[PDB]
Design a protein around this ligand. Structure first.
Ligand SMILES: *[C@@H]1O[C@H](CO)[C@@H](O[C@@H]2O[C@H](CO)[C@@H](O[C@@H]3O[C@H](CO[C@H]4O[C@H](CO[C@H]5O[C@H](CO)[C@@H](O)[C@H](O)[C@@H]5O[C@H]5O[C@H](CO)[C@@H](O)[C@H](O)[C@@H]5O)[C@@H](O)[C@H](O[C@H]5O[C@H](CO)[C@@H](O)[C@H](O)[C@@H]5O)[C@@H]4O)[C@@H](O)[C@H](O[C@H]4O[C@H](CO)[C@@H](O)[C@H](O)[C@@H]4O[C@H]4O[C@H](CO)[C@@H](O)[C@H](O)[C@@H]4O)[C@@H]3O)[C@H](O)[C@H]2NC(C)=O)[C@H](O)[C@H]1NC(C)=O
Ligand SMILES: *[C@@H]1O[C@H](CO)[C@@H](O[C@@H]2O[C@H](CO)[C@@H](O[C@@H]3O[C@H](CO[C@H]4O[C@H](CO)[C@@H](O)[C@H](O)[C@@H]4O)[C@@H](O)[C@H](O[C@H]4O[C@H](CO)[C@@H](O)[C@H](O)[C@@H]4O)[C@@H]3O)[C@H](O)[C@H]2NC(C)=O)[C@H](O)[C@H]1NC(C)=O
Ligand SMILES: *[C@@H]1O[C@H](CO)[C@@H](O[C@@H]2O[C@H](CO)[C@@H](O[C@@H]3O[C@H](CO[C@H]4O[C@H](CO)[C@@H](O)[C@H](O)[C@@H]4O)[C@@H](O)[C@H](O[C@H]4O[C@H](CO)[C@@H](O)[C@H](O)[C@@H]4O)[C@@H]3O)[C@H](O)[C@H]2NC(C)=O)[C@H](O)[C@H]1NC(C)=O
Ligand SMILES: *[C@@H]1O[C@H](CO)[C@@H](O[C@@H]2O[C@H](CO)[C@@H](O)[C@H](O)[C@H]2NC(C)=O)[C@H](O)[C@H]1NC(C)=O
Ligand SMILES: *[C@@H]1O[C@H](CO)[C@@H](O[C@@H]2O[C@H](CO)[C@@H](O)[C@H](O)[C@H]2NC(C)=O)[C@H](O)[C@H]1NC(C)=O
Ligand SMILES: *[C@@H]1O[C@H](CO)[C@@H](O[C@@H]2O[C@H](CO)[C@@H](O)[C@H](O)[C@H]2NC(C)=O)[C@H](O)[C@H]1NC(C)=O
Ligand SMILES: *[C@@H]1O[C@H](CO)[C@@H](O[C@@H]2O[C@H](CO)[C@@H](O)[C@H](O)[C@H]2NC(C)=O)[C@H](O)[C@H]1NC(C)=O
Ligand SMILES: *[C@@H]1O[C@H](CO)[C@@H](O[C@@H]2O[C@H](CO)[C@@H](O)[C@H](O)[C@H]2NC(C)=O)[C@H](O)[C@H]1NC(C)=O
Ligand SMILES: *[C@@H]1O[C@H](CO)[C@@H](O[C@@H]2O[C@H](CO)[C@@H](O)[C@H](O)[C@H]2NC(C)=O)[C@H](O)[C@H]1NC(C)=O
Ligand SMILES: *[C@@H]1O[C@H](CO)[C@@H](O[C@@H]2O[C@H](CO)[C@@H](O)[C@H](O)[C@H]2NC(C)=O)[C@H](O)[C@H]1NC(C)=O
Ligand SMILES: *[C@@H]1O[C@H](CO)[C@@H](O[C@@H]2O[C@H](CO)[C@@H](O)[C@H](O)[C@H]2NC(C)=O)[C@H](O)[C@H]1NC(C)=O
Ligand SMILES: *[C@@H]1O[C@H](CO)[C@@H](O)[C@H](O)[C@H]1NC(C)=O
Ligand SMILES: *[C@@H]1O[C@H](CO)[C@@H](O)[C@H](O)[C@H]1NC(C)=O
Ligand SMILES: *[C@@H]1O[C@H](CO)[C@@H](O)[C@H](O)[C@H]1NC(C)=O
Ligand SMILES: *[C@@H]1O[C@H](CO)[C@@H](O)[C@H](O)[C@H]1NC(C)=O
Ligand SMILES: *[C@@H]1O[C@H](CO)[C@@H](O)[C@H](O)[C@H]1NC(C)=O
Ligand SMILES: *[C@@H]1O[C@H](CO)[C@@H](O)[C@H](O)[C@H]1NC(C)=O
Ligand SMILES: *[C@@H]1O[C@H](CO)[C@@H](O)[C@H](O)[C@H]1NC(C)=O
Ligand SMILES: *[C@@H]1O[C@H](CO)[C@@H](O)[C@H](O)[C@H]1NC(C)=O
Ligand SMILES: *[C@@H]1O[C@H](CO)[C@@H](O)[C@H](O)[C@H]1NC(C)=O
Ligand SMILES: *[C@@H]1O[C@H](CO)[C@@H](O)[C@H](O)[C@H]1NC(C)=O
Ligand SMILES: *[C@@H]1O[C@H](CO)[C@@H](O)[C@H](O)[C@H]1NC(C)=O
Ligand SMILES: *[C@@H]1O[C@H](CO)[C@@H](O)[C@H](O)[C@H]1NC(C)=O
Ligand SMILES: *[C@@H]1O[C@H](CO)[C@@H](O)[C@H](O)[C@H]1NC(C)=O
Lengths: 132, 452, 132, 45
């Protein structure tokens, strides 16, 4: 079987594959984002809707410090209550759709922690540069 | 040495002008003039923060919120009246006469008018009869014609839509906020030291009235008097009461609603006949609740006008739209003769114990019905109010008063709805849209690091 | 008196407090940004207005180099003419609203300096990478 | 008719029945119209 570089795959591809495998196809999804008459009003409503949805994700990314980084590590640790499965069975035994459904209840708590942590990363850094 | 740093998200705001959109709770084909079904659901419990150590100036006389939503109402009214019948064919000769039925003696307020009305087919015409009020027909050199025939074609309200005053919330977009004052003794203009930020306002009921504000919010501490220039007598005065007085108004009669065809696809409803006796509409107001209410406001006016006798008199006269207290009740437009209400004066020196006035005594009023209305104090539109079968009764609470002032000694205050916009100024007096400026620059000792 | 972590405060909170104290509540303000009929047109006009206002601030931040940083130091020095008060009385004796009112006249000059300074930080850095 | 002036064949005094404020009644009215906006018939315009 000849190999595909994963850059040639289409939109929403590798959705049914493992999380680890799908982590190599993040680029293709990002490209498709932001792709007088009765039709004009509906078309105009569509354009603003696309802008609003794209900007919502970017606003969260900026606060978390991943303004432009596609994959970014953070300092907050993972809690076993949110997920109890081992690393081997997460990246190689289920898809991304199942993972998000599992942890959909704890998304609010995690989001707030990233803002609090990243905000703390800024004030202490500022204190360090004031010693010159 | 000090260096410049940039802060994002600081608590800084600047006054600005911006558009607003409605928001109301879900209600449920049902049709409403305000289209509250299209409004955005507001919230179960909106977020409100009370700011501290902050003082902000307010000025309700230069508030764009009142000007903005004023143009919204007329567009909403115009929006819903396009798909409705036009009564141009009704401009025909009327053979009116006294109504006959077996107080009743004073029956010179409604006439039995007969006219030739076009049937479904254009060529044929048949005779029809309907009842019209005296205020909507004028005589000729012994026939009558509708008042609006020589002014403009006058449309009809479709009975499907109901125009009851559903409360609505005007909410601003993101990046803007609305500041709410909380001082209980705050007049129209001045600093507010208990300002609180809110995403948007509370439920505001659009009510059309001339002399009295109805079923509105109450003042908390005491009576509030607001006026841009009290010394100037040419500007209206808004009075907000801390205690409300109930008002009961009714049109007691079972009047059959008759559908009359006037053309192909056009049909309008009129008053059919009277089943019983002829009895005028009236409104009842308790004597003590008004005598005491005018007593409390009288002493409040004494501070602004020291050692001056204050008297309340009826309106001067002229056009009926503003001389009388016009309001709505189930879709019927009333015009109440408000002369007995303002038949007393306040004496700064004297005894005013309320037990002297007998209880269980009400103030009956004379009110007339006018089913042809021209709105917004401009002759560019009309609307025919259809009748309702059976007798109606509307109960509400009086909330505020719209008074006007007019050489030495006694001070005369009279009621008058000089401008319609003052009705909502009494509700938006404690609101102000503002813009957010989250950029902040201040010096600091931290320096950006440069990689070499 | 029990303590509040400053993440639980509401929008526009700490506005009447000192500048230094208010510097710890930057996160809450950032969250609220970007939160056929007659109503649709007004609502549609509101959505575009919010997007335009948010993007205006982000455009300035990107040029200054603080693309995602909530608190960022710079290399341009502060001028005594713009403000003469000491550091102690600035962060602990007045609010942010007064501070912006005081220096609102010199805002245009500072904005140009940041663009000029940051642009210079890029060309000289590029010259350093060309020595390999 | 009024008391160049000789070449008056550019504006004509046209009379017609115009509906008053009330639909049924009609009254006679007169107005002046230019010759370019009215056409004759087999002596009415
Ligand atoms: C500076 O100004 C401040 C603001 O005025 C002021 O703070 C206020 O102080 C007063 C006095 O202490 C507080 O008054 C109490 O309020 C209780 C109800 O509070 C809840 O409801 C409020 C109103 O909610 C409507 O309006 C909001 C406007 O923004 C909307 O956002 C709401 O959605 C809601 O709208 C709905 O209703 C509207 C009409 O009500 C309607 O138009 C609209 O369309 C919609 O239908 C809320 O503001 C308030 O929210 C605050 O608090 C909650 C937590 O409770 C938070 O989650 C919020 O974030 C926010 O902080 C509440 O939701 C009253 O029940 C209470 O009455 C009792 O107490 C008084 C006096 O003590 C008695 O007279 C009264 O009879 C009651 O006591 C009786 O019963 C008890 C039993 O329960 C009994 O034991 C007792 O003996 C007695 O018999 C009281 O009036 C007010 O809540 C404070 N906050 C606000 C926001 O007003 C501050 O003091 C000032 N001074 C300073 C800063 O120094
Ligand atoms: C100031 O504010 C007060 C307080 O609301 C207003 O007073 C109310 O006004 C409304 C609107 O005019 C009144 O609502 C009407 O009630 C009628 C009677 O309802 C009772 O009886 C029926 C059976 O007959 C019961 O089913 C019902 O539950 C009540 O017990 C209704 O018959 C009216 O119906 C209208 O709306 C329906 C909606 O589907 C239509 O289908 C009908 O055709 C009709 O149009 C109407 O709902 C209310 O009764 C008044 N009192 C109270 C206590 O709310 C003042 O009018 C207001 N004043 C001003 C100037 O704004
Ligand atoms: C609360 O309720 C009380 C009573 O229920 C009201 O008090 C009444 O007020 C009216 C209006 O002032 C009183 O009626 C009369 O007022 C006259 C005002 O004087 C001017 O007008 C007269 C008119 O002829 C002129 O002649 C005069 O020169 C002035 O220009 C008084 O002059 C009248 O006095 C006569 O009657 C009283 C009867 O009480 C006699 O005692 C006098 O001697 C004189 O003959 C008359 O008073 C009415 O009398 C008051 N009723 C009382 C006091 O019980 C309050 O007005 C109301 N509260 C509010 C805020 O309105
Ligand atoms: C209004 O006038 C009409 C006539 O224009 C009355 O209609 C007549 O009423 C009498 C007595 O009720 C009947 O005998 C006739 O048959 C009716 N004729 C028509 C054509 O309706 C009507 O009753 C009058 N109504 C009132 C309230 O005076
Ligand atoms: C309505 O139509 C009737 C006929 O369909 C009119 O009756 C005629 O009215 C004229 C008035 O100038 C009289 O000269 C005729 O003698 C009437 N004819 C008959 C048969 O009565 C009537 O005038 C029209 N208008 C009204 C208001 O009824
Ligand atoms: C204001 O009203 C008071 C009463 O409400 C008037 O007081 C009376 O004044 C007359 C003279 O005009 C005296 O004869 C009476 O004795 C006064 N009443 C009492 C109880 O003494 C007063 O005159 C009015 N005018 C002014 C300027 O106060
Ligand atoms: C008691 O009545 C007197 C009336 O004399 C009020 O005070 C006087 O008001 C007149 C108004 O024309 C002034 O000319 C006098 O100068 C006032 N008297 C004084 C001493 O200044 C007085 O206000 C009344 N009492 C109350 C509580 O209203
Ligand atoms: C205070 O209220 C009482 C309540 O009645 C008034 O007393 C009445 O006064 C009238 C006239 O003097 C008498 O005819 C009644 O018999 C009295 N009734 C009672 C129960 O006393 C009193 O006049 C009021 N005070 C005033 C007006 O100063
Ligand atoms: C107000 O005036 C009326 C006048 O009718 C008073 O009505 C009286 O009420 C008492 C007690 O209910 C009855 O005994 C009388 O017969 C009634 N008078 C009649 C029927 O003429 C009423 O009481 C007065 N208000 C107050 C508070 O007393
Ligand atoms: C146009 O024609 C009308 C008649 O259709 C003229 O109106 C009459 O004019 C004469 C003389 O000016 C008067 O005596 C009559 O009283 C008028 N009658 C009416 C009904 O208007 C009008 O004068 C003519 N105008 C021109 C410019 O020729
Ligand atoms: C305007 O109306 C008048 C009557 O109101 C018309 O006058 C009649 O015209 C007809 C034409 O066929 C004649 O047979 C009648 O004898 C006329 N009657 C009278 C009383 O003069 C007139 O024709 C209508 N049209 C115009 C252009 O005036
Ligand atoms: C996980 O969350 C629970 C619930 O608040 C907390 O008690 C626990 O300390 C958390 N785990 C870690 C490692 O912080
Ligand atoms: C969580 O995982 C551990 C081992 O990974 C297991 O022993 C434990 O039973 C799990 N907890 C639950 C609730 O299944
Ligand atoms: C108008 O009504 C009166 C009522 O007496 C009647 O006599 C008259 O004939 C009516 N008009 C016509 C044109 O019939
Ligand atoms: C109607 O009744 C009044 C009452 O006096 C009377 O003057 C009038 O003439 C009556 N009209 C007719 C047409 O009978
Ligand atoms: C509001 O301001 C008034 C004066 O303008 C003051 O008397 C009142 O106490 C204030 N309200 C408070 C402090 O709640
Ligand atoms: C309103 O209140 C302010 C401050 O309390 C006061 O200066 C002003 O005279 C009052 N009246 C008006 C019309 O502003
Ligand atoms: C309303 O204000 C007046 C002002 O004099 C006061 O006397 C009365 O007690 C107040 N009533 C209420 C219910 O607050
Ligand atoms: C009110 O108008 C009068 C008219 O001369 C003026 O003298 C007074 O200064 C005005 N007061 C205000 C605007 O507060
Ligand atoms: C009015 O007439 C209708 C129809 O005859 C009747 O049902 C109704 O009860 C009458 N009104 C009253 C108050 O009796
Ligand atoms: C209003 O007062 C009048 C006074 O006589 C009375 O006849 C009528 O029944 C009252 N209406 C009510 C209480 O609805
Ligand atoms: C109102 O009624 C009074 C008497 O009750 C009368 O003098 C006055 O002319 C009336 N005004 C109007 C506009 O009907
Ligand atoms: C205000 O009006 C409502 C509905 O009409 C009523 O339930 C309420 O009791 C009124 N307020 C007072 C103080 O009577
Ligand atoms: C501050 O600005 C003035 C005005 O241009 C300038 O002369 C001065 O050198 C500046 N200060 C510094 C430290 O650059």
């Amino acid at each position: 079987a000849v190999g595909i570089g994963a850059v040639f795959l289409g939109f929403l591809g590798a959705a049914g594959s493992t999380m680890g495998a799908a982590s190599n196809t993040l680029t293709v999804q990002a490209r498709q984002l932001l792709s007088l008459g009765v039709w004009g009003f509906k078309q105009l409503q569509a354009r603003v809707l696309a802008i609003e949805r794209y900007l919502e994700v970017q606003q969260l990314l900026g606060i978390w410090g991943c303004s432009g980084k596609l994959i970014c590590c953070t300092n907050v640790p993972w809690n076993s209550t949110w997920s109890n499965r081992t690393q081997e069975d997460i990246w190689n035994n289920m898809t991304w759709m199942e993972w998000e459904r599992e942890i959909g209840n704890y998304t609010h708590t995690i989001y707030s922690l990233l803002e609090e942590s990243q905000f703390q990363q800024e004030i202490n850094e500022k204190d360090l540069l004031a010693l010159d | 040495n000090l260096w410049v740093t940039v802060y994002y998200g600081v608590p800084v705001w600047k006054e600005a002008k911006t558009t607003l959109f409605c928001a109301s709770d879900a209600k449920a084909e049902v049709h409403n003039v305000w289209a509250t079904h299209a409004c955005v659901p507001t919230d179960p419990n909106p977020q409100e923060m009370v700011l501290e150590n902050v003082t902000e100036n307010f000025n309700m006389w230069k508030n764009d919120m009142v000007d903005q939503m004023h143009e919204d109402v007329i567009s909403l009214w115009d929006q819903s009246l396009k798909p409705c019948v036009k009564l141009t064919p009704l401009c025909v000769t009327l053979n009116c006469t006294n109504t006959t039925v077996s107080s009743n003696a004073n029956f010179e307020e409604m006439k039995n008018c007969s006219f030739n009305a076009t049937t479904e087919i254009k060529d044929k015409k048949k005779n029809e009869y309907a009842l019209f009020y005296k205020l909507d027909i004028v005589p000729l050199n012994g026939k009558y014609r509708l008042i609006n025939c020589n002014t403009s074609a006058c449309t009809q309200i479709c009975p499907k839509v109901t125009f009851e005053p559903i409360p609505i919330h005007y909410c601003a977009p993101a990046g803007y906020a609305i500041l709410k004052c909380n001082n209980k003794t705050f007049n129209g203009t001045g600093p507010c030291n208990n300002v609180s930020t809110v995403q948007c306002t509370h439920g505001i009921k659009p009510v059309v009235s001339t002399q009295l504000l109805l079923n509105g919010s109450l003042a908390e501490k005491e009576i509030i008097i607001r006026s841009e220039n009290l010394t100037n007598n040419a500007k209206t005065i808004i009075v907000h009461l801390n205690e409300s007085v109930g008002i009961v108004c009714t049109r007691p009669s079972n009047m059959t609603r008759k559908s009359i065809r006037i053309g192909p696809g056009q049909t309008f409803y009129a008053l059919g006949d009277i089943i019983g006796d002829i009895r005028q509409p009236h409104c009842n107001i308790s004597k003590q609740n008004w005598n005491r209410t005018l007593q409390q406001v009288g002493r409040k006016l004494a501070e602004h006008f020291p050692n001056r006798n204050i008297t309340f008199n009826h309106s001067s006269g002229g056009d009926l739209e503003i001389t009388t207290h016009s309001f709505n009740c189930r879709g019927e437009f009333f015009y109440c003769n408000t002369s007995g209400l303002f038949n007393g004066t306040y004496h700064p020196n004297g005894t005013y114990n309320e037990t002297a006035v007998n209880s269980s005594d009400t103030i009956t009023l004379q009110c007339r019905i006018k089913q042809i209305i021209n709105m917004w104090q401009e002759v560019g539109r009309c609307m025919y109010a259809p009748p309702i079968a059976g007798n109606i009764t509307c109960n509400s609470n009086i909330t505020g008063l719209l008074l006007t002032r007019d050489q030495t000694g006694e001070e005369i205050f009279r009621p008058g709805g000089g401008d319609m916009r003052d009705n909502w100024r009494s509700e938006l007096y404690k609101y102000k849209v503002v813009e957010i400026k989250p950029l902040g620059i201040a010096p600091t000792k931290c320096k950006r690091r440069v990689v070499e």
